[PDB]
Amino acid sequence: NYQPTPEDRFTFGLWTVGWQGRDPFGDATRRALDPVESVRRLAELGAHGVTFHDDDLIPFGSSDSEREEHVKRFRQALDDTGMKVPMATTNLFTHPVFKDGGFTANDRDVRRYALRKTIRNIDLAVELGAETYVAWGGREGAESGGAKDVRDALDRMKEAFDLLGEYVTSQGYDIRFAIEPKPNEPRGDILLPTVGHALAFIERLERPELYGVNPEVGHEQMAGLNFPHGIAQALWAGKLFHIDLNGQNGIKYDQDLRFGAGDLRAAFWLVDLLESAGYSGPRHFDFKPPRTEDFDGVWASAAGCMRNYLILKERAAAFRADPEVQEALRASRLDELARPTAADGLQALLDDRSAFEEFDVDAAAARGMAFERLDQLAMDHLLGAR
Amino acid sequence: NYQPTPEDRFTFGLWTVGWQGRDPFGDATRRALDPVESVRRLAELGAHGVTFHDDDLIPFGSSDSEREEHVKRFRQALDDTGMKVPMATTNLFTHPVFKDGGFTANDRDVRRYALRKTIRNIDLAVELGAETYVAWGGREGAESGGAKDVRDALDRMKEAFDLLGEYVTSQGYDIRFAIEPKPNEPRGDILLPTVGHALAFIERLERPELYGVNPEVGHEQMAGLNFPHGIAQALWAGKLFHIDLNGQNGIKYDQDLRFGAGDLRAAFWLVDLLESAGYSGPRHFDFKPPRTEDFDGVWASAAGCMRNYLILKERAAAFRADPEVQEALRASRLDELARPTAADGLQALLDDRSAFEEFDVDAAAARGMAFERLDQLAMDHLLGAR
Amino acid sequence: NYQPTPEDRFTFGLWTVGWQGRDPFGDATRRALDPVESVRRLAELGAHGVTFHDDDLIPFGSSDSEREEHVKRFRQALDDTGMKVPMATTNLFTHPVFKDGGFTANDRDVRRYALRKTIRNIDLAVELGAETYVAWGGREGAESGGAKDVRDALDRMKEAFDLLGEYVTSQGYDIRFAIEPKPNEPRGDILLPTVGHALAFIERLERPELYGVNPEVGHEQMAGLNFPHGIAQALWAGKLFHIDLNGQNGIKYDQDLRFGAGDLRAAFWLVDLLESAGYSGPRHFDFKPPRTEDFDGVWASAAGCMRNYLILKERAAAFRADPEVQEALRASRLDELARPTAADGLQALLDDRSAFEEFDVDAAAARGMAFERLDQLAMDHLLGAR
Amino acid sequence: NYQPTPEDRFTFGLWTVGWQGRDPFGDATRRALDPVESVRRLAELGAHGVTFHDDDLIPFGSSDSEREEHVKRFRQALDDTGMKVPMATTNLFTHPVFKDGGFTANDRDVRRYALRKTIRNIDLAVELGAETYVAWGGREGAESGGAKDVRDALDRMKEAFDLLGEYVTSQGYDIRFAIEPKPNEPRGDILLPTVGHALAFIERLERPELYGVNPEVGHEQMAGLNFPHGIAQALWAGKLFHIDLNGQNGIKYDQDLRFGAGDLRAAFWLVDLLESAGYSGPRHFDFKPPRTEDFDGVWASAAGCMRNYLILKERAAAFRADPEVQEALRASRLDELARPTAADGLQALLDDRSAFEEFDVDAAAARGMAFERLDQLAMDHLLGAR
């Protein structure tokens, strides 16, 4: 039951199932994985593909010959399995040189280095077939108020993204960029901390059509925000280029639980929205199998990400198809929400006495919205209790 | 010491000092105030002006003759004191008809009513001299996932703001709109929950130049976000049309404490940024004197808002003017953050071996940023301990 | 399916289904309910009983004759339906006199009044059959640091609870007290903010055996705490005298959603624990039907509280009874967690070389805990996807 | 100005200034420090002493000869500087064997190992002069509901603390234990997550007088709780055996900023309370210099912890000594809060008509508490703006 196949477009970062379990208070609990092994094991579970940071696929500091062999072995694993590489990203956070940021480091030489490291990896990502290049500015931010003038930092961040767009255009590449917001951790506060801040920033770039967002479930929940609402705004803007799926229990450190863990009802409404909107990109899991697990638990955790998506997909589709739910949606006026407020135009609205002078405010106020009945139908569908 | 005068541009909502102290668990602890009295008492404290919701100035349901007398008395209080009215707003949240929203109510007749109620008050706001019209969509949102399709709701919200822009343009008014974000409360989640989401939405409106943000200290802090950072992004976008100043202790209900209470260091960095950026709009307090207070405590609380702004203004200016701080800012490379990363252009960056092939990553990583020394100078300045 | 009956011990506060929908930003959306009607409608839904604050059952300020008639009508509704009254409480938060607290008000005359108001209602609660008397100190706390010396306030709170215990002992009553913690709202911070702080305080009372806790799902979640863990500690202490069931979406204002809404997985683990531990008290819902609802939605929301408890009870029981889960629990060493660490005693442990000198730390570290497989079995059971 | 000396009792963990800067997303930015160097540098800054985990002072896995040399060098640094060692603790979190806990690990052999590792270090702590032994159960908890039966885990935690008390009693040691709560991180939820839960647990131990709490500023703030309030409850219980001072910006990952950073007003009210209550234990800083800093920034950050404590101590003492504040405290009835509610006894209260039948509730309700004036005096004192 609920068995994934590559057609479901489920993808995993090499750093997810490859996480060795080091945390701020703990040493590694698992040995490092060869990317080749991760590709094979994920393919056996029904995954569609994998994603990578530059430094996950090629150890930092590798010589050209070593780099060529790493890529060759990875390419052979992709060929052996039929796995794809839909997205890649740059590691601009692990190395100490990035301790104050990459694109917005106060040191200009570090900013130039970060751009060169990214451009090198864009070339590789294109070679491996990626359609999206993600930027997660995890080190862009501050622990103290004097350390970062944010207007200057946003100037530098715009310059960096503009140069990357000039670069991909210069090479004729079709790849597009997706900014992954996060509100905090590892910096005390991170620039572009939410989907909204990232969407707003893109609109000031030179070529905004090249940039979208890669929202992550847990990151918007770390700000206490409603992730399905933020996804709806990204879709409304035409900017949901990619998504990171995982679980998070509220406002605390970034947990990266498997998808479906954390806020289960939010996971249900997310799947409902992605399927209703026809999102066609990768269903990418950015999760960490807990460091309590051995390698068998790693693969059980990855399998559970995909299983939970498929269960929620079934339950959301049953909800929207149920005639009793369709009647409840009309009872709650979701049909009226989708109708224009004033297609008659401004002057007609101003002249419409039923909109003000003769509007019976008390009769309107007395009409219940029937949202609790609708939501209990949604709960009954989610739980299989209809 | 620290005595405000009207030139400091401090303004207060009638609903702030007028709050009677009703909370979700408590009846009123103070009698209602006549707006005329609030104008007089605020003017005596050194305020520049006042702001209003339609229903603060004219009781809901007033006849035309009553409305004319309310406005006449208010105008005479403004004339007697020299107080101004720089901003007004519509109450689209108190009346039960708005229980599911105003501009994004599922009922289309309620959406049309909300627009007509707003347009009536825009006319009054212009008559009283307001330069900004604020929209706080406190009822726009949901407690459950099925109750609001957010893409449809954003369609309705765009339609509403577009019609309001068509209206002000049709009348030749100079007033501009400012959206006030809030993440939650009274709805479980509110649409446009942060500065970023509001900035992003404005960019999809028909006439984006007419709309900016009215961020509130406590609202961004209710999402755990850094308010000075969000203000910097709004300034970077050219969209800080107005601001609401108050205090909040972290992620919990909207406290609306007096400015300077709550997160004191964030208040310091906010004042530093507003003064450095040359923000020229009203310094508006959206606060509630705690319901423990009598009327004398109300005015003490309002006075404390202005006092705390003026103390922080002095301390931030002393910080930025101190030669030892200026040296520390250079030591931490804030000068380098303000320099373009690659004014030499993309090809020059790609050909620059000092940016990659010959970049000494370890030497760069070893350079301390000296941010702790800088931040302790900032603390010493804030505390008057230099 | 999932139909409650009085044997399931579900109870509701009169203030829950009776909530008129006033919030900090909104007027009432529903008319007041007669307690008699609430008793009848709840009984028809399958409830076991109701609970009350003094001022829910008898309007504040009633004369003795009015008080007698209110009680008489309520008693007749209980007799007509077979509903019980297992718990009552005092309203020490709505009236303005309590603006700085009841038992810990700075004014001594208010503290004495609060005690007298409570004692009057203890007598009534006993007359109506209540076994538990709840204290929720919603006004005990502060918005500012100077306003409340907390050691002195805890002295006053101990004095109050000690006097109430002296009173019930003096009358020969069997009723016991349960303190309901909440971290904040309506005060900026509330004294005894969590289950732990309340348990710790009880241990300093004169007669600790008379006092336990009445934890509420949403209140511990407002501090980001794990409600099943806090319930387990209360059960471990022998102090779970009563419980308040509802839903909450994380750290924000007190939402009081219907049970099962909010954090669904936490609701599952709570029901699992209450049923496994054999909790025999009332399953009391302290919830507010959202103000979007009409009276039909009120009863739909109350019905959904009970339905969701019964669904989760079925799924948790199926989880614990499944032989595959029982094998997974052994694989994860939950059996070993329940065995004493050192029943052999201290000297035997000190002399046991297998505990230190010869303990193979690496072999132990390499053993996976298999928690992800266990948790996916739990998810499959909760979702009915086995 | 504000220069610390050893008489101020400021202490630092070796792991604080010794933190190399590894975070969940970043490699080390600083070289490891020799404990001898940290002792010397801290002594030069005016510190009183240092604290240690076993594995900070002696590398894990050291032979007896290596252990003896590590201790010998450390003892010579203490002798050379006059630094003391007032507290020590065990590392039961870094090694992978502790991935599911130490005292509450599901594996019984790990629980026995954790006890033996602790007992070995208690002996060393006593040899070095420590008066307090801290337990921070950072790995005691869970990411999922099935993985840990919390009642069984609390049984195991009680067994462990009881055995440690039996051990110290058996040796005639005077050292006492202090439990350090934390709500989450590194586990999804940690057992005994707050001061209150720890205080409540101690009351169920065999010899409760041997155990107190070691609360940390940032940890209670990670639950959104008011740290001065929790400290007041610990003092009220007689259980403040030790304290960890640092800074935290609200509900997010554990930041461990230097003391005075984070919530400055809470730091002021904490210092006010510690000084007013006459707390005589170490003023211990559990902080991490940010990984942006070099070694000079490490010592600047440590110096700033002590400076900020001394500034706040001066400002709080000036507040409490100011006759205008003393008058404001009487105006707000803080004197009445410290008076018994009913020293006349229960029967006198029941017979006192001024407490109920003749209490003028409206006159009492109308009396303002004057808390805003009091709090602005506190702000003026903190800012040096009187």
Ligand SMILES: OC[C@H]1O[C@H](O)[C@H](O)[C@@H](O)[C@@H]1O
């Ligand atoms: O950008 C790719 C990834 O980089 C890092 O691993 C971040 O922790 C993760 O959130 C992000 O998705």
Ligand SMILES: OC[C@H]1O[C@H](O)[C@H](O)[C@@H](O)[C@@H]1O
């Ligand atoms: O929009 C004007 C005001 O409306 C309401 O009073 C909101 O509570 C407040 O935040 C907002 O500033």
Ligand SMILES: OC[C@H]1O[C@H](O)[C@H](O)[C@@H](O)[C@@H]1O
């Ligand atoms: O104490 C009884 C009840 O009093 C109030 O209604 C509180 O809001 C609620 O949480 C509590 O359960």
Ligand SMILES: OC[C@H]1O[C@H](O)[C@H](O)[C@@H](O)[C@@H]1O
């Ligand atoms: O228990 C001593 C210390 O152990 C660890 O370093 C914890 O991170 C810290 O909070 C605690 O104080």
Ligand SMILES: [Mg+2]
């Ligand atoms: Mg991610």
Ligand SMILES: [Mg+2]
């Ligand atoms: Mg506001």
Ligand SMILES: [Mg+2]
């Ligand atoms: Mg309750």
Ligand SMILES: [Mg+2]
């Ligand atoms: Mg600590």
Ligand SMILES: [Mn+2]
């Ligand atoms: Mn994440």
Ligand SMILES: [Mn+2]
């Ligand atoms: Mn507010």
Ligand SMILES: [Mn+2]
């Ligand atoms: Mn509640």
Ligand SMILES: [Mn+2]
């Ligand atoms: Mn900490």
